Design a protein around this nucleic acid. Structure first.
Ligand SMILES: [Mg+2]
Ligand SMILES: [Mg+2]
Ligand SMILES: [Mg+2]
Ligand SMILES: [Mg+2]
Ligand SMILES: [Mg+2]
Ligand SMILES: [Mg+2]
Ligand SMILES: [Mg+2]
Ligand SMILES: [Mg+2]
Ligand SMILES: [Mg+2]
Ligand SMILES: [Mg+2]
Ligand SMILES: [Mg+2]
Ligand SMILES: [Mg+2]
Ligand SMILES: [Mg+2]
Ligand SMILES: [Mg+2]
Ligand SMILES: [Mg+2]
Ligand SMILES: [Mg+2]
Ligand SMILES: [Mg+2]
Ligand SMILES: [Mg+2]
Ligand SMILES: [Mg+2]
Ligand SMILES: [Mg+2]
Ligand SMILES: [Mg+2]
Ligand SMILES: [Mg+2]
Ligand SMILES: [Mg+2]
Ligand SMILES: [Mg+2]
Ligand SMILES: [Mg+2]
Ligand SMILES: [Mg+2]
Ligand SMILES: [Mg+2]
Ligand SMILES: [Mg+2]
Ligand SMILES: [Mg+2]
Ligand SMILES: [Mg+2]
Ligand SMILES: [Mg+2]
Ligand SMILES: [Mg+2]
Ligand SMILES: [Mg+2]
Ligand SMILES: [Mg+2]
Ligand SMILES: [Mg+2]
Ligand SMILES: [Mg+2]
Ligand SMILES: [Mg+2]
Ligand SMILES: [Mg+2]
Ligand SMILES: [Mg+2]
Ligand SMILES: [Mg+2]
Ligand SMILES: [Mg+2]
Ligand SMILES: [Mg+2]
Ligand SMILES: [Mg+2]
Ligand SMILES: [Mg+2]
Ligand SMILES: [Mg+2]
Ligand SMILES: [Mg+2]
Ligand SMILES: [Mg+2]
Ligand SMILES: [Mg+2]
Ligand SMILES: [Mg+2]
Ligand SMILES: [Mg+2]
Ligand SMILES: [Mg+2]
Ligand SMILES: [Mg+2]
Ligand SMILES: [Mg+2]
Ligand SMILES: [Mg+2]
Ligand SMILES: [Mg+2]
Ligand SMILES: [Mg+2]
Ligand SMILES: [Mg+2]
Ligand SMILES: [Mg+2]
Ligand SMILES: [Mg+2]
Ligand SMILES: [Mg+2]
Ligand SMILES: [Mg+2]
Ligand SMILES: [Mg+2]
Lengths: 90, 59, 102, 59
RNA sequence: GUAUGAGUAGCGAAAGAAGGGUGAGAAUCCCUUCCACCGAAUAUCUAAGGUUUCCUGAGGAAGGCUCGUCCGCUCAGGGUUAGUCGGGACCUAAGCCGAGGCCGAUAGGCGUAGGCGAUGGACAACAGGUAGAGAUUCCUGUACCAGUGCUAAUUGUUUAAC
RNA sequence: GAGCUGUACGUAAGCGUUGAUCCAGAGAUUUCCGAAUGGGGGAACCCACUAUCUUUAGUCGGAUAGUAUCCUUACGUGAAUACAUAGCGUGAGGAAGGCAGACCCAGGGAACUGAAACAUCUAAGUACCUGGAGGAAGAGAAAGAAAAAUCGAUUUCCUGAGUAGCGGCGAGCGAAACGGAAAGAGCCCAAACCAAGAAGCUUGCUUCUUGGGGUUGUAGGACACUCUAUACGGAGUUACAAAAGAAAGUUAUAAAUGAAGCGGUCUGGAAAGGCCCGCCAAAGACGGUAACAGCCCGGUAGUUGAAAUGGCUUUCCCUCCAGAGUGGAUCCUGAGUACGACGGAACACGUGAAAUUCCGUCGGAAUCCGGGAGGACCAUCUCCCAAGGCUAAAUACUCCCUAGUGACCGAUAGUGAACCAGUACCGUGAGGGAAAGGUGAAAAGCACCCCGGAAGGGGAGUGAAACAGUUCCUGAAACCGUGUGCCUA
């Protein structure tokens, strides 16, 4: 379930800025651990992972007229690869 | 669980009356004694009424 | 519905009574039909990516399907329709001329 | 669907793996902003689902 | 629903002034200078509690006891990184639950073994940098704790290293 | 059978006569919490153990299955303590929780109120709490009702009757049988005896199990003999024993077909309306369509249709089966039971002259030459046979599904809720609890010009209508204004 642990990449200004330091930002499902993310990345992309950091994000309250709800929760991972390794294109 | 194991009689409610016939609630209890009998091939202590005890059981 | 896309239509009631046209679209969920040259409206449209210049555009609007009758491909008069299973297909049949419309 | 039933229950899972890889690449392109036709997502998802259905009902 | 009281009471402790700017519009927004107030606080951290109020770009109907070009307000995008910090995977106090058990019209009450439960005990990381928003977490230097494999020597074999 | 990717516009990308979207039956998938069940927990979270496998150079990681408690049962181990039991372990079966705010059975059980005060009494075995259910429950085949003569298991309805009675004889409470109906159905044990086995040794005996036999009041059965009968016949899963399998039919859950006016003319934005002519009808139900339609549309009466699954009814299959008579030695026919005293309760019946039924506590029978009842009790007579069990229908109710109905409401009404309502909001919590429908037939929802930062206007245009302009049908009164005929310091 490597393709299930990793959902999609994250493309913002901060992630694009850190792309040059060999750090890649991904959205992962909310039950995966760091180790699972590391092994899923190494299997999908054929790189050598040096480190993974993770964080959790709550949903944001939103309104579109008389109706209020929340966006989805998110789990965000940053993966840094070793110096002697290829890169992910994005 | 406070009741006879043979002919399982226990407490029941009723009225206490006075002269002038005022009515109040009370209970009647059975006189269960704690005795050691053979519920199986083995003995044990149980509640048995004194009525169920005057012909038939083995103490 | 009783009228299909690509059919010939005689308009039975309304402001365009007595005219004829062709079915350009059908809306069975709301029970309307779009017919060429029939029931023209004028839309005041601001300039947009579609319609680059905008203006008073004269286009067509749907009408109710009950204001419509089929035109026989040969006799050429409005007919009620029946259904006859001829061969491996059920086909529509003109109920005046007693012939197959399809 | 009927041509899926002609496969030998081992190439079926190779097809499943290939479809999963294609679906992941499609979502990567959609996130990056480089996917032209988006109707492919539904097709791939339904194809995987029917592979799984046919494998399961063969037991 | 709408009057009268009535353009009346009030506008919630306090020092401001001028010159530039922006803008349709400025006592009220931005910048400069001068003046004034707190200073065992009206300063700096941090628990609780709140839950996106945080940053950036747009906005000015309503909210803000006045005004507003502004805002803790509206809209759209972002933002929270830990082997060592605080908690769990460690421990127990008050208290709570409680197999069997004891008691009792029913429902249940009490209680042993056992287990939960910090406000307490134990336990390994420091100094710098970071101009939109995180920092003992990221990065740069230099460490420590627990483990694992692989090498190289040493040593021990059931009066028995460990 | 031609469009489709919901509300829901739109953009984007696509799919369908090689038959999509859609409708009905049957399957597969079905995260986490919750009886929640591997352990814990502040709901949807945290942390495991045991087997088998997998990845890595190895720690690190991953997959699958099992792992709660109690009851019943089989096997195994096993203490004080010798045999043994308790305890411990494994396996196999079962339970647990919810609800339709209804209906019914049981355990427990108020007060306000009425009595023009109040305590007996009433309210009332009501409200409420708790436990068991079932599609119904409960009751039920006479130890009955009766009385110059009989009836023949229960239940429900009409009468009896506000009668007979009960009652600080106050307030009040209040039957039953006979008579008329709905519906109807009857049966298994225990015990005498037979046969077999086992335990104790009650030591040649009793007592335990299994099978057969047998269930009643004119007494019946065991027991003796006659007659027939072992499937000739009979019965059955709704009691009377219990579990299956086929075929035919019908019905339910999608559907198909289906007559007759584009008739002329007037008004109109539009004809289904008016006037003048036709037609269909086993079809003049209902709804829609630019105004009021049997003949425009969906349909309606009639006639058809089912691959699949469900229900019901028959037939087959399957399964199970002794019943008459004549006798009167001996034997059997429900024991701490029936009854009685004391204390209570239920009976319409408040202890009363109090029968009848039940509970607690004590005492305590007879057994066919026997026992119970007939409202204290005795004698006579009459009727019946307790202390074991099962049983359909007629009766009660509606969270639901299908088809309909109403001298029922019409947005302050009708549900609290016609609208994203048990929501917003209030409260620590249990809990309380709103307001809010209508453009137009069709968005044709006002291109363009002008004043203004915008909002908002004035034209122009659409429309039948804009004094219908996205709180939009109509648009009363209060209340706020502008203008003016007559009066007023
Ligand atoms: Mg890791
Ligand atoms: Mg975290
Ligand atoms: Mg978070
Ligand atoms: Mg975060
Ligand atoms: Mg009383
Ligand atoms: Mg006793
Ligand atoms: Mg005694
Ligand atoms: Mg006022
Ligand atoms: Mg100034
Ligand atoms: Mg906010
Ligand atoms: Mg304000
Ligand atoms: Mg003010
Ligand atoms: Mg401005
Ligand atoms: Mg803001
Ligand atoms: Mg930590
Ligand atoms: Mg622990
Ligand atoms: Mg420490
Ligand atoms: Mg080492
Ligand atoms: Mg799933
Ligand atoms: Mg739980
Ligand atoms: Mg638990
Ligand atoms: Mg958590
Ligand atoms: Mg492993
Ligand atoms: Mg044992
Ligand atoms: Mg021993
Ligand atoms: Mg239950
Ligand atoms: Mg129920
Ligand atoms: Mg009382
Ligand atoms: Mg009473
Ligand atoms: Mg009473
Ligand atoms: Mg109950
Ligand atoms: Mg049931
Ligand atoms: Mg019934
Ligand atoms: Mg019953
Ligand atoms: Mg009878
Ligand atoms: Mg009988
Ligand atoms: Mg008789
Ligand atoms: Mg009846
Ligand atoms: Mg028998
Ligand atoms: Mg005989
Ligand atoms: Mg005409
Ligand atoms: Mg006209
Ligand atoms: Mg007409
Ligand atoms: Mg009719
Ligand atoms: Mg009609
Ligand atoms: Mg007509
Ligand atoms: Mg006796
Ligand atoms: Mg008597
Ligand atoms: Mg008596
Ligand atoms: Mg009598
Ligand atoms: Mg009798
Ligand atoms: Mg019964
Ligand atoms: Mg109204
Ligand atoms: Mg409308
Ligand atoms: Mg309308
Ligand atoms: Mg201007
Ligand atoms: Mg304007
Ligand atoms: Mg008007
Ligand atoms: Mg109007
Ligand atoms: Mg008006
Ligand atoms: Mg008015
Ligand atoms: Mg005047």
């Amino acid at each position: 379930d490597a393709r299930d642990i990793i959902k999609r990449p994250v493309v913002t200004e901060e992630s694009t800025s850190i792309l040059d330091d060999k750090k890649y930002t991904f959205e992962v499902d909310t039950r995966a651990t760091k180790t699972q993310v590391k092994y899923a990345i190494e299997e999908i992309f054929d790189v050598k992972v040096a480190k993974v950091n993770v964080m959790n994000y709550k949903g944001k309250l939103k309104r579109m007229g008389r109706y209020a709800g929340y966006t989805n929760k998110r789990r965000k991972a940053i993966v840094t690869v070793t110096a002697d390794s290829k890169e992910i294109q994005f | 669980a406070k009741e006879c194991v043979i002919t399982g009689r226990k407490s029941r409610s009723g009225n206490k009356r006075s002269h002038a016939m005022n009515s109040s609630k009370r209970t009647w209890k059975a006189n269960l004694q704690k005795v050691r009998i053979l519920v199986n091939g083995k003995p044990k202590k149980v509640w048995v009424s004194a009525r169920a005890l005057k012909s038939g059981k083995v103490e | 519905m009783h009228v299909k896309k690509g059919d010939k239509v005689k308009v039975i009631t309304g402001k365009d009574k007595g005219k004829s046209g062709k079915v350009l679209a059908a809306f069975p969920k709301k029970d309307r039909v779009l017919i060429e040259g029939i029931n023209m409206v004028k839309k005041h449209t601001k300039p947009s990516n579609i319609n680059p210049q905008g203006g008073i555009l004269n286009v067509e609007a749907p009408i109710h399907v009950s204001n419509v009758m089929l035109i026989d491909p040969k006799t050429g008069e409005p007919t009620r329709v029946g259904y006859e299973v001829k061969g491996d297909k059920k086909v529509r049949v003109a109920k005046k001329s007693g012939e197959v419309i399809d | 669907a009927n041509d899926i039933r002609d496969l030998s229950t081992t190439e079926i899972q190779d097809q499943e793996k290939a479809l999963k890889e294609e679906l992941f690449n499609l979502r990567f392109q959609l996130a990056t902003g480089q996917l032209e036709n988006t109707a492919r997502i539904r097709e791939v998802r339904k194809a995987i689902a029917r592979m799984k259905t046919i494998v399961r009902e063969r037991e």
